[PDB]
Design a protein around this ligand. Structure first.
Ligand code: ADP
Ligand code: MG
Lengths: 363, 634, 363
């Protein structure tokens, strides 16, 4: 069955990252190549922690940095509709793919309000947009730029914990191509529903980490370090994140660019979404067990039992609430491939794989 | 429908498709319904190339205009062609308000205009056409390819797949479906269902019975075994139950039945219900659909009788157009005359017209009676014979061609066309005219290729001493157990042998004694507006009902103690068929038997039936079809 | 083999129209009842040709009658896009279905430009719009109102027939619920790409016919009638169209109503789209061959064989222009249902079935 095989094949993919079939960033136009990234890894190693912080972290501290709406507007597609409240943006832009024009959904953390910090009603608004784009057969592009989702008293009183996990559940299981692109900073539970992608990119001067560099200060007090040293040690650079497999590509684009690097953004979105779609078509030819999964998923829609239907009503999730707005077979390939993508960039080892440190001359 | 049928034969056999299309447009004289043909045929060509790949050519010729041009001819997957000199605009001269240049209408000037065609081909009939068109304008674009060049290039570029051995154009044929019957669907209620359920036991066939809500607890349902099935159709009336053909077919498919007996009444005589079963491969117990339409269409039944040298009841012979037509055909026959509905039957819409003065108003009137009753105002005229016998002759025939004619019946004691006292012989019919109707039944049975049980009806004019064919029953007739006795041949068992694919050559029709049937019906006596006695239905619960066991009477019945006679259905509660040596003995035994029979709770027609059997004129056998309403007034 | 099956089923369903499961007229909430229809048949029978013309023909000719945009605006939804292109008017509106809002596509013949008379580029726009809604899984409400498509010199020079043949091909093969609603006059080949719907309705004072009633004047001259007599003899009232089985019911609304009856148009649309979706789910429950047809159509998208791939390039048709924009299994059910209803709207008999007229007493 698909569920048993989905963990097995992603577990096999985690044994050997380098010669895996998951590499789609070789085919995408508008990225920094391996050679450019190696030269910058020498520069990041030869710089002190202060020079690392100025190259990587300080450009996302720029308060005048072009917003997530403005980055979407510089695609020069046809705006159909936009949904906007606070630091949540979403849009529906009909972009020219070369062959024809196509509606692509955009869901974006907008930094012009609260620095990009989402409340519970923004995660529920993102869920509403994720449901709509699934039903309406539209590829999604996530834009990530936040200090993290708001963890305050009103957030937890409004149940931020359930709103975040509902958004991660619906994003993980959405039936259209999702391409995350880190356009500034991405941290923790506020960034991971939007970083749940078939391809996750960054811009040239973005950041992506577990929590903000300054939030490592509590851990820095244990070892008598600065917070800056901790962020340099763990590597929050797009180049070190590419090397550690966290992101697929670094787009040769910063939000302010006015030359042919502003054209790389559009080309990277078009050739990311075409690469994710080609990968779904190849996997449908390869897998008979994907066909069996589509039958089991569609058969419970044909005969909705009271126990199954009641849990779906309580949850209010992205589901086939119409036969016309039921997903296709390739929708089930986008949920499966998104799992493989996210699962092959987590690694863990056993107690026998770990070698012991020397206790000799350490009393 | 012909285009969809052809594309289906092409999809089955893997044929390339060639089309030569010329049209003045969609047929406007077919109503608004004709427009949907543009989308039907275009969808079948869209689906034909997208599911079956085989190339469709569209050679537009002559005038190629209106909806034929505006859909399938110019469809983007077909290879569109035009002959030289073809007129190809969106609409023709009948619809176009003003002149359209040959640059925008003639296929020559449109040949080089992009997307108009894959080529302009030569017109292979009009010898001098391209030189005649070059003399009109030398700068006109000329044709280049031939129709043979386009077809040889279309055929030679395809993969030549190895052809299967040729089959005929496969149509609805019951004879293929006729296989041994061990489970049968019975489409009936009442005494007809009891008769068919009894015959199913006697032939060792399981019954799948279908029924309305009053009829789920009827006597035909009680007669079933644990191995026999009963299925709910729902509702009270015929419309909510038996007349739903899709529910009955879905039961035939669900139970996987070996055949379907279409019963009597409801949908029994409809060639649409016969075709519906045979489309889905379900064996229809009765004639072919061809035999049902030939003898069910009243004009074509007369025309087939004319071809077989069988005298018809004199009339219009086809259908009347208008009141002026009705007056002129009526005058030629001599008044009074009949007006009858084509989709009639059961005496419905049969008007007698006494005069030319009456006929003008009575045609318009009876056209409204037919149009109200059936949705078709079509009248046809027949000669009103005032002194007649309704003689009817039972045919059996197999698929091999043995026309075993069993004998005649006389059903002249009838009330509002519905038969009441029916007999195995006619006491006023000469043996020479009896031999003529026997020969005419064989001629019709063989010349329509008829199967199963059937009954041809004759008017036996008492004034003229002549026999005339009226119409045919293309199914089982309620009067049948009278002929089962006197022929020595079981009519439903012979029909179940025929519908199992067996021969009836082995049968020997006899003339065993005499027989008579009284239809026992649940009706009370009541006076009309002038004081003449009528019978009208009496519904309700039956409290006591005894039919004593007697060897020379057959009882088919739905009456028993504690059963109810439903107001949603007919008052027919039993058929009592007496047998005996001679006619006086059959009358006397039936008279004595009707007094030994008891019915309570309900009223019954039996006080009238006993008095007809004690009438001197009836005992002598001297009467006509109009005897009964005269005798009820006495 | 669904191609063979749809002619079999549609022949079966046309043998007895009244008790067939093609009768969806009970479902739609906002139609007139069969009693009011029977009463309107009695009035149209008892009236003359002038009383029939006043009741039926004159209100569809009325220049003061609300246009396609005004009718769509007074559904009182949220318009998302519009495309006014001469006498063509496509649109896209969110309607409330009670459980949630839904995108419903529109393609309408606008009477306030060229009287609703369509040109070749309006048919090519209708081709494109029908693919565009199919690629986005949006149900379509067609609005019919035309004197017929143009028979003029400019139309035939632009290849008028060849634009309509593609428009009917897209409509017949679209993978979303199609509802037709006659909002005025439905004459000839200009009315049929829109009237090729699953459920074809009419407003209370609409008309649908083979050509405009003045075009019957040529046939009236040939047999010595007036064109008004030929129009009544053909039977062009919504009541007579419902009796012949051309349409699936009469919506209790006329474009100018402002009582309770203005609410019946959105209700009739909601209950029509819901009725087609419930009927299509019931067809996927019971047709195992609808799976085989979908898998055979899917296998062509996986491996586009050169002879049909070249035909799809030249023909430009509504196909899977992406794995994401590939139709669902219910998409093939809307094609199937649409054929069964179109094929049971047409009806023919045989030479043996037809009752022959009297030769007797004919000069
Ligand atoms: N002019 C007539 N001559 C003879 N029978 C007539 C005439 N007019 C009406 N009938 C009645 O109709 C019969 C002909 O068959 P019919 O009653 O129409 O059959 P059904 O109604 O069972 O189809 C005649 O026997 C007679 O009872
Ligand atoms: Mg009769």
């Amino acid at each position: 069955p698909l569920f048993l095989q989905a963990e097995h094949l992603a577990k096999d993919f985690s044994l050997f990252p380098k010669h895996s079939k998951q590499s789609l960033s070789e085919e995408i136009k508008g990225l920094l190549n391996d050679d450019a990234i190696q030269a910058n890894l020498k520069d990041l190693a030869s710089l002190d922690v202060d020079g690392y912080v100025a190259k990587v972290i300080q450009p996302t501290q720029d308060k005048g940095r072009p917003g997530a709406k403005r980055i979407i507007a510089d695609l020069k597609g046809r705006l159909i509709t936009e949904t906007h409240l606070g630091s949540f943006y979403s849009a529906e832009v009909e972009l020219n793919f070369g062959s024809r024009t196509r509606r692509i959904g955009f869901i974006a953390q907008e930094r012009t309000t609260a620095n990009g910090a989402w409340m519970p009603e923004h995660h529920y608004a993102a869920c509403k947009a994720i449901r709509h784009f699934a039903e309406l057969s539209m590829p999604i592009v996530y834009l990530i730029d936040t200090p993290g989702a708001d963890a305050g008293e009103v957030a937890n009183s409004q149940n931020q914990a359930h709103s975040i996990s509902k958004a991660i559940a619906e994003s993980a299981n959405v039936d259209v191509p999702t391409v995350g692109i880190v356009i500034g900073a991405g941290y923790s539970g506020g960034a991971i529903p939007l970083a749940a992608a078939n391809i996750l990119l960054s811009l040239r001067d973005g950041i992506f980490n577990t929590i903000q560099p300054q939030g490592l200060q509590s851990i820095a007090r244990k070892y008598n370090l600065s917070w800056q040293e901790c962020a340099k040690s763990v590597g929050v650079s797009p180049e070190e994140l590419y090397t550690s497999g966290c992101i697929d590509g670094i787009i040769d684009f910063s939000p302010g660019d006015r030359d042919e690097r502003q054209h790389n953004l559009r080309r990277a979105i078009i050739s990311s979404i075409e690469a994710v779609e080609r990968a779904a078509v190849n996997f449908v030819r390869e897998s008979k067990d994907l066909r069996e999964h589509y039958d089991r998923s569609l058969a419970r829609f044909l005969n909705p039992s009271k126990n199954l239907m009641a849990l779906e009503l309580n949850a209010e999730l992205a589901v086939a609430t119409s036969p016309t707005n039921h997903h296709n077979l390739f929708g089930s390939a986008y949920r499966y491939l998104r799992y493989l993508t996210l699962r092959s960039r987590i690694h863990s080892i056993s107690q026998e794989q770990y070698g012991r440190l020397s206790r000799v001359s350490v009393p | 429908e012909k285009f969809s049928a052809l594309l289906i034969e092409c999809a089955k056999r893997k044929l390339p498709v060639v089309c030569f299309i010329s049209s003045g447009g969609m047929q406007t004289k077919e109503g608004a319904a004709a427009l949907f043909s543009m989308a039907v045929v275009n969808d079948r060509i869209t689906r034909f190339i997208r599911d079956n790949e085989l190339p469709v050519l569209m050679f537009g010729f002559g005038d190629c205009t209106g909806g034929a041009q505006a859909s399938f001819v110019t469809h983007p997957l077909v290879q569109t062609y035009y002959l030289s000199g073809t007129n190809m605009p969106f609409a023709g001269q009948m619809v176009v308000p003003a002149y359209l240049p040959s640059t925008s209408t003639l296929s020559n000037y449109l040949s080089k205009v992009p997307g108009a065609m894959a080529g302009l081909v030569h017109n292979p009939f009009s010898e001098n056409l391209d030189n005649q068109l070059a003399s009109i304008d030398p700068l006109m674009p000329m044709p280049t390819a031939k129709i043979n060049e386009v077809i040889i290039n279309a055929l030679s570029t395809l993969v030549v797949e190895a052809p299967a051995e040729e089959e005929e154009i496969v149509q609805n044929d019951p004879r293929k479906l006729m296989k041994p019957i061990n489970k049968v669907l019975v489409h009936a209620r009442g005494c007809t269902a009891v008769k068919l359920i009894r015959k199913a036991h006697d032939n060792n066939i399981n019954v799948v019975l279908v029924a309305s809500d009053p009829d789920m607890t009827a006597v035909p349902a009680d007669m079933l075994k644990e191995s026999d099935k009963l299925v709910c159709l729902g509702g009270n009336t015929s419309d909510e139950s038996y007349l739903n053909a899709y529910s009955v077919l879905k039961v035939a498919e669900y139970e996987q039945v070996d055949a379907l007996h279409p019963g009597i009444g409801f949908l029994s005589e409809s060639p649409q219900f016969a075709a519906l079963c045979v489309n889905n491969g379900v064996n229809f117990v009765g004639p072919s659909v061809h035999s049902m339409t030939t003898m069910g269409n009243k004009s074509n039944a007369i025309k087939t009788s004319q071809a077989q040298n069988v005298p018809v009841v004199p009339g219009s012979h086809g259908i009347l157009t208008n009141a002026e037509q009705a007056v002129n055909v009526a005058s030629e026959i001599g008044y009074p005359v009949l007006l009858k509905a084509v989709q009639g039957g059961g005496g419905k819409g049969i008007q007698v017209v006494k005069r030319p003065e009456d006929m003008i108003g009575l045609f318009q009137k009876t056209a409204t009676e037919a149009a109200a009753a059936f949705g078709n105002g079509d009248l046809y005229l027949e000669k009103y014979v005032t002194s007649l016998r309704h003689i009817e002759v039972q045919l059996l025939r197999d698929k091999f061609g043995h026309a075993k004619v069993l004998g005649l019946r006389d059903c002249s004691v009838q009330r509002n066309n519905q038969k009441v006292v029916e007999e195995s012989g006619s006491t006023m019919l000469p043996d020479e005219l009896k031999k003529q109707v026997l020969a005419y039944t064989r001629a019709l049975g063989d010349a329509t290729d008829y199967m199963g049980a059937g009954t041809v009806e004759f008017i036996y004019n008492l004034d003229a001493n002549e026999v005339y064919f009226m119409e045919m029953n293309t199914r089982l007739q309620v009067a049948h157990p009278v002929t089962e006795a006197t022929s020595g041949i079981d009519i439903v068992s012979a029909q179940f042998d025929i519908a199992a694919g067996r021969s009836i050559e082995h049968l020997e029709p006899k003339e065993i004694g005499y027989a008579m049937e009284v239809r026992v019906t649940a009706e009370k006596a009541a006076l009309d507006s002038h004081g003449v006695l009528q019978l009208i239905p009496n519904p309700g619960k039956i409290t006591e009902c005894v039919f004593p066991d007697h060897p020379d009477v057959e009882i088919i019945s739905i009456a028993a103690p504690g059963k109810e006679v439903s107001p949603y259905y007919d008052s027919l509660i039993a058929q009592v068929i007496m047998r005996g040596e001679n006619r006086e003995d059959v009358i006397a035994k039936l008279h004595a038997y009707l007094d030994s029979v008891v019915l309570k709770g309900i009223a019954t027609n039996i006080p009238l039936l006993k008095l007809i059997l004690s009438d001197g004129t009836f005992k002598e056998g001297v009467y006509d079809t109009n005897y009964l309403p005269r005798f009820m007034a006495e």
